[PDB]
Amino acid sequence: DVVMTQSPLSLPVTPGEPASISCRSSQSLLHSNGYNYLDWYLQKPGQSPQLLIYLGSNRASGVPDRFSGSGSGTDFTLKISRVEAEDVGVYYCMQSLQTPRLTFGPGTKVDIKRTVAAPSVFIFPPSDEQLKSGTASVVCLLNNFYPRGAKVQWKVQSGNSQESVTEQDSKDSTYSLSSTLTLSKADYEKHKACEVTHQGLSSPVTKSF
Amino acid sequence: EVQLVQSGGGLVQPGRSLRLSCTASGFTFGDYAMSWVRQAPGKGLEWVGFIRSKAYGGTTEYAASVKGRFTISRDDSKSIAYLQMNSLKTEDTAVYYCTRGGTLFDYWGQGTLVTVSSASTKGPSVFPLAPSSAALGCLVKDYFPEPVTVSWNSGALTSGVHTFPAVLQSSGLYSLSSVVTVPSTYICNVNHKPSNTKVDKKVEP
Amino acid sequence: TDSEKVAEYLRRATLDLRAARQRIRELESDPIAIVSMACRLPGGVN
Amino acid sequence: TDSEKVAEYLRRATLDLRAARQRIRELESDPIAIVSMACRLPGGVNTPQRLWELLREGGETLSGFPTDRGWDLARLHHPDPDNPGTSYVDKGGFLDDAAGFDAEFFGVSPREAAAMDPQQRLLLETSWELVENAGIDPHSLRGTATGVFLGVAKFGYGEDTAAAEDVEGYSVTGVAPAVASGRISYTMGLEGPSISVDTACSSSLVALHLAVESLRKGESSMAVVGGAAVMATPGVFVDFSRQRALAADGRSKAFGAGADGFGFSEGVTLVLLERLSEARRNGHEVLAVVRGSALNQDGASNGLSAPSGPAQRRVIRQALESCGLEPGDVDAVEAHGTGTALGDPIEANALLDTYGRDRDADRPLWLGSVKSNIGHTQAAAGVTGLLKVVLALRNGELPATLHVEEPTPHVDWSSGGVALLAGNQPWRRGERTRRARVSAFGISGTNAHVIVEEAPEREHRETTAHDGRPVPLVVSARTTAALRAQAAQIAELLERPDADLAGVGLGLATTRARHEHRAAVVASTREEAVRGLREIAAGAATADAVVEGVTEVDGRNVVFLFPGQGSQWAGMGAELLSSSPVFAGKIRACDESMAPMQDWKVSDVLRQAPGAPGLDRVDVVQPVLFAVMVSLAELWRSYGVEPAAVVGHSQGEIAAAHVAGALTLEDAAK
Amino acid sequence: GTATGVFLGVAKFGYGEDTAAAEDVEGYSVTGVAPAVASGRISYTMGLEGPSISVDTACSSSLVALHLAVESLRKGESSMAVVGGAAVMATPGVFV
């Protein structure tokens, strides 16, 4: 029924290059009265989205000239001429052959590209007065790394690892990772080990307390 | 361009009603269909329903998970779109956008963030973080509601501070951390405004 | 309903087409207002 | 459904939104093609090719003061920059022929010609050569909307002596600076706006910008853009001898350690501009394309005649942004280095803050200046840079810069973003478009920058195409002496083993005007045309193929005369049926129409094949003559000879009624 | 610092050109009588940052300058335009 559409999930591109995004559908997506049954979209991080391309052929009024769009059949391309500072955000590819649709699309995340960076790891155990309070909490902080991909695991766990990832920057894209592992006193007394695997590193670094 | 003005956010109890309001300035409201898109953390955009303009009927359509739970109404004489929600659940703490057009989602409003909560207000509990690995900080745990402000040396030290968003855990209370970096006196001041508490906790270097 | 889909695209063409034509009119036929004038003329007229 | 009243309107809204953004781009960012260029320069240079040769040598055009202009050269020179009324410079570039004019050609009386500023006469000659260089007949521009934009200023001519008694007033419109373009528009017949600007040595680029504006708006078809600067008094040298602004040796040392003044020169330069779409719709020749331009003012500075840096950077950025480009699509920039100990570092530092800034490393940006070769032109410097850029683009090489043996130590050269041209660098075409830019910074404050590019991919390898069939070569001139001059020119042109005879004939027939004294040679081979032109230039006409004469009325009324019977001979047009198709077609149609009523073919009798009757019997002689005359009349009319009356002697009235249309071929055969 | 254009119509009539030039090393006798400084001097003493042009059209110069100013304002390279002309005699030559 609904034609499946996709796009690459992430593609950091340095400013000054003709970046491109693709939308490879499963079945033919065309419009008889118009050209193609497709609509490109954009949303910068933190505000309302906006329309960029409609029929996959037009260029919306109010969006810059460097944007464009082409393609047919099952393959489409959003040909961008140049990349600037405020180009970061999320891109979406939507089809309008039959409605209501259900393949809304995860969207492509675009940010600033930089060289590989390795995180500095800091393991902080709960304080002594926190131990007197009756609830334990360790934190495994990763600082100054790029790009994303570092997933932490506690081998001392599962279902209680809340990660507070730093927001998408606009100066050099330098993220910081932090985890919230909550423990109780009877739970802390037996767990008395955060492991990190990143392409900035080479081996999975394990820090204990 | 034209302006969509939206209001109706706030605190909700799981299982009761709430109605939004969206007015339009700069264009005729009686000719456009209106769609509603919810946005919640950990997920992308999601169409939840849409209503048709007059001269084409008044038919309304909804999503599978909300059919029989939500309703959408409008008034073209006074020109508002209303979304009325009955029996809200705790997973719908989200910001709602009203979009012009049934299929061409041409315009998106500023949106309002409305939340259903089962927990009451609570003061924070700030704990120091001793380095046992240079970096040092404090953890703000078990507070409600947003937001909270953290400062170091009464606003003197502003470099190297790394605050983090308060990710909701499985319980229903908020917890974040603020960590600065210093090579090697050091205190963090946490202010919770709606409960009117100001703690100054020293952190061992 | 094939009216709804083909009509809503023609209201986002009426918008953009007006914007483009109006920019064209601004480009070629913009009236120019006169703000002030000064002159030195013979016969003591200044 | 679609109702084809809502989905049929969609197809005519989405195909109008596209002739609107595109119409917007046509309105604001239309590139302007350059068609042809002409120049009079000091040192005997009166053609762009000699200019290019002088540029690749790295030569000099520095000579002494003129002697035939009436100057007092023994009471003028003084080796001390004091004693006003005297000048301490003894060098300078000057024209070799500044007092020459062809009065009778343009219809100007000798006294009016003697009352002209020589700038106007040189501009007239240069404009005529500019028009003729584009392969355009100069009589086809009459009534068309062609603009004339010029940069010219007064230097003092005949204003020191008492005015003679010319009641008609020949001494005001000759020296006035507003007639330098109106006179061209009057003597040439152009119908477009004519403006003579003043911008204090940035006038040429201001006129070019105005021409680009006019062409993009759509009120003009072609533009003649240029400047002129011909001295008549040595005053400029004396005045700048008082301020010690002139170079001691008279050489402009652009971007060199030791520049201590500028040196002036004389020159007239013109270019022809047209829209690219109309340039390649009509089939003209494209040399380069002007993309964008920018103008501004120096503003409030530390002096009325002092340069500023931020103004130059801002005008550079405006020139970059107005066309949609960025700093880095550049191969070389034409600078305004006049040898100013103070302006050269400022301009160079302005160039390294935009172009050599954070630039790619595998080349620097080439910096050059033309003022080190010919000197300061002070009215046509920007257009001279335009000609240098066009010549470099066409010939595929960047000429070097003189007097840069090492650079001045006041420019920070270690960045590597800008390097001086110290030699000839190849500039062949490749993967990247080859762009470059010219920069003229006036003394009154107005600064300008223009960005030139290469011409699109095109094929011109079709000129070499010749047949064994006869070619007519027709020459025409206003005077007999000019007639032999042009004949000798064409005869010496047809000497070389690569000059196509058919191409020369077509160029003479199409791309040249028609004058009072005319001559023509019909030649089947190449040495025959050489000998015919030999005789024409020799002042005689004795051979068989040469026909010459003079006409005073520019058009005739043709009357066709068809004689009777008694002028036949066996073998009429025996080859014409094989060499000309119209003759054979008309004969052949007449033959089908005459076939039912005789048993023989007309071509059979004409070609003397066996089995056909002779031409001694009247019943076969008359139809043959009828067919021959009607075919000849149709062949005459196929070449553009439109008759106005037909007359017949004895039996030619039938053919006359045929040609007049009063009958058909049908009842004519009957 | 604002982008304001100065478009003028002015021509030379003869001033101080019949007498011998005095000894001003700084050159005060060229930029004073030149027709290309009539607008540059205004732009320098007032601080305007726009194009300055002094045209010649033989008594139709003012309207030509006005047309050029309209063109410049419509294109968008200028904010304001000072458009005018000047004609002050210094010799009776025109009458003679």
Side-chain angles (χ1 to χ4, degrees), chain A residues 132-152:
Chain A
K132 299 288 95 175
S133 68
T135 300
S137 65
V138 299
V139 59
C140 176
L141 187 140
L142 278 73
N143 199 358
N144 298 300
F145 62 97
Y146 178 81
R148 283 76 58 208
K151 185 69 177 176
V152 298

CSV table of all heavy atoms in Angstrom, one decimal, chain A residues 132-152:
chain,number,residue,atom,x,y,z
A,132,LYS,N,25.3,8.4,53.4
A,132,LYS,CA,24.6,8.5,54.6
A,132,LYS,C,23.1,8.8,54.3
A,132,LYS,O,22.2,8.4,55.1
A,132,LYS,CB,25.1,9.6,55.4
A,132,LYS,CG,26.6,9.5,55.9
A,132,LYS,CD,26.7,8.4,57.0
A,132,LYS,CE,27.1,7.0,56.4
A,132,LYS,NZ,27.3,6.0,57.5
A,133,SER,N,22.8,9.5,53.2
A,133,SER,CA,21.4,9.8,52.8
A,133,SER,C,20.6,8.5,52.6
A,133,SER,O,19.4,8.4,53.1
A,133,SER,CB,21.3,10.7,51.6
A,133,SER,OG,21.8,10.0,50.5
A,134,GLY,N,21.2,7.5,51.9
A,134,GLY,CA,20.5,6.2,51.7
A,134,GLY,C,20.2,5.9,50.2
A,134,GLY,O,19.4,5.0,49.9
A,135,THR,N,20.9,6.6,49.3
A,135,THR,CA,20.7,6.3,47.8
A,135,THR,C,22.0,6.7,47.1
A,135,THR,O,22.6,7.7,47.3
A,135,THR,CB,19.6,7.2,47.3
A,135,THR,OG1,18.3,6.9,47.9
A,135,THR,CG2,19.4,6.9,45.8
A,136,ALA,N,22.5,5.7,46.3
A,136,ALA,CA,23.8,5.8,45.6
A,136,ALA,C,23.5,6.2,44.2
A,136,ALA,O,22.5,5.9,43.6
A,136,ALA,CB,24.6,4.5,45.7
A,137,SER,N,24.5,6.9,43.6
A,137,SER,CA,24.5,7.3,42.2
A,137,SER,C,25.9,7.5,41.6
A,137,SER,O,26.5,8.4,42.1
A,137,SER,CB,23.6,8.5,42.0
A,137,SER,OG,24.2,9.6,42.7
A,138,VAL,N,26.3,6.7,40.7
A,138,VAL,CA,27.6,6.9,40.0
A,138,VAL,C,27.3,7.6,38.7
A,138,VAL,O,26.2,7.6,38.1
A,138,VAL,CB,28.3,5.6,39.8
A,138,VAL,CG1,28.6,4.9,41.1
A,138,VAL,CG2,27.5,4.7,38.9
A,139,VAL,N,28.3,8.3,38.1
A,139,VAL,CA,28.2,8.9,36.8
A,139,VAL,C,29.5,8.6,36.0
A,139,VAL,O,30.6,8.7,36.5
A,139,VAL,CB,27.9,10.4,36.9
A,139,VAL,CG1,29.0,11.1,37.7
A,139,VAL,CG2,27.8,11.0,35.5
A,140,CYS,N,29.3,8.3,34.7
A,140,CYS,CA,30.4,8.0,33.8
A,140,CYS,C,30.4,9.1,32.7
A,140,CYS,O,29.6,9.0,31.7
A,140,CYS,CB,30.2,6.6,33.2
A,140,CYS,SG,31.5,6.2,31.9
A,141,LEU,N,31.2,10.2,32.9
A,141,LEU,CA,31.2,11.3,32.1
A,141,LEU,C,32.2,11.2,31.0
A,141,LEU,O,33.4,10.8,31.2
A,141,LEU,CB,31.5,12.6,32.9
A,141,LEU,CG,31.4,13.9,32.2
A,141,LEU,CD1,30.7,15.0,33.1
A,141,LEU,CD2,32.7,14.4,31.7
A,142,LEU,N,31.8,11.4,29.7
A,142,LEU,CA,32.7,11.5,28.6
A,142,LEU,C,32.7,12.9,28.1
A,142,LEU,O,31.7,13.5,27.9
A,142,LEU,CB,32.2,10.5,27.5
A,142,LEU,CG,32.6,9.1,27.6
A,142,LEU,CD1,31.8,8.4,28.7
A,142,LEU,CD2,32.4,8.4,26.3
A,143,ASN,N,33.9,13.5,27.9
A,143,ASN,CA,34.1,14.9,27.6
A,143,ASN,C,34.9,15.1,26.3
A,143,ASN,O,35.9,14.3,26.1
A,143,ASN,CB,34.8,15.6,28.7
A,143,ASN,CG,34.5,17.1,28.6
A,143,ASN,OD1,33.9,17.6,27.7
A,143,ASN,ND2,35.1,17.9,29.6
A,144,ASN,N,34.5,16.0,25.4
A,144,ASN,CA,35.3,16.5,24.3
A,144,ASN,C,35.5,15.3,23.3
A,144,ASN,O,36.7,14.9,23.1
A,144,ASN,CB,36.6,17.2,24.7
A,144,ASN,CG,36.3,18.4,25.6
A,144,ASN,OD1,35.7,19.3,25.1
A,144,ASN,ND2,36.8,18.4,26.8
A,145,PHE,N,34.5,14.8,22.7
A,145,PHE,CA,34.6,13.8,21.7
A,145,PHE,C,33.7,14.1,20.5
A,145,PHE,O,32.7,14.9,20.6
A,145,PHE,CB,34.1,12.4,22.3
A,145,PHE,CG,32.7,12.4,22.7
A,145,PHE,CD1,31.7,11.8,21.9
A,145,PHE,CD2,32.3,12.8,24.0
A,145,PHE,CE1,30.4,11.8,22.3
A,145,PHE,CE2,31.0,12.7,24.4
A,145,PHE,CZ,30.1,12.2,23.5
A,146,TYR,N,34.1,13.6,19.4
A,146,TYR,CA,33.4,13.8,18.1
A,146,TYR,C,33.8,12.7,17.1
A,146,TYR,O,35.0,12.4,17.1
A,146,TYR,CB,33.6,15.1,17.5
A,146,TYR,CG,32.9,15.4,16.2
A,146,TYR,CD1,31.6,15.7,16.1
A,146,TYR,CD2,33.6,15.2,15.0
A,146,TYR,CE1,31.0,15.9,14.9
A,146,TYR,CE2,33.0,15.4,13.8
A,146,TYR,CZ,31.7,15.8,13.7
A,146,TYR,OH,31.1,16.0,12.5
A,147,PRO,N,32.9,12.0,16.4
A,147,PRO,CA,31.5,12.2,16.4
A,147,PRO,C,30.8,11.3,17.4
A,147,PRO,O,31.4,10.7,18.3
A,147,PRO,CB,31.0,11.9,15.0
A,147,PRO,CG,32.0,10.8,14.6
A,147,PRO,CD,33.3,11.1,15.3
A,148,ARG,N,29.5,11.1,17.3
A,148,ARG,CA,28.7,10.3,18.2
A,148,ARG,C,29.0,8.8,17.9
A,148,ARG,O,29.6,8.4,16.8
A,148,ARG,CB,27.2,10.6,18.0
A,148,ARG,CG,26.7,11.8,18.8
A,148,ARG,CD,27.1,13.1,18.0
A,148,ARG,NE,26.6,13.1,16.6
A,148,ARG,CZ,27.1,13.7,15.6
A,148,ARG,NH1,28.2,14.4,15.7
A,148,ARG,NH2,26.5,13.6,14.4
A,149,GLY,N,28.6,7.9,18.8
A,149,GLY,CA,28.7,6.5,18.6
A,149,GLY,C,29.1,5.8,19.9
A,149,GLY,O,29.1,4.6,19.9
A,150,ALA,N,29.5,6.6,20.9
A,150,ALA,CA,30.0,6.0,22.1
A,150,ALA,C,28.8,5.5,23.0
A,150,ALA,O,28.0,6.4,23.4
A,150,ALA,CB,30.8,7.0,22.9
A,151,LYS,N,28.6,4.2,23.2
A,151,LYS,CA,27.6,3.7,24.0
A,151,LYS,C,28.2,3.1,25.2
A,151,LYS,O,29.1,2.2,25.1
A,151,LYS,CB,26.8,2.6,23.2
A,151,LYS,CG,25.5,2.1,23.9
A,151,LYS,CD,24.5,3.2,24.1
A,151,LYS,CE,23.2,2.6,24.8
A,151,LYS,NZ,22.2,3.6,25.0
A,152,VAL,N,27.7,3.5,26.4
A,152,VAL,CA,28.3,3.0,27.7
A,152,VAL,C,27.5,1.8,28.2
A,152,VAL,O,26.3,1.6,27.9
A,152,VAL,CB,28.2,4.2,28.7
A,152,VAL,CG1,29.1,5.3,28.2
A,152,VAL,CG2,26.8,4.6,29.0
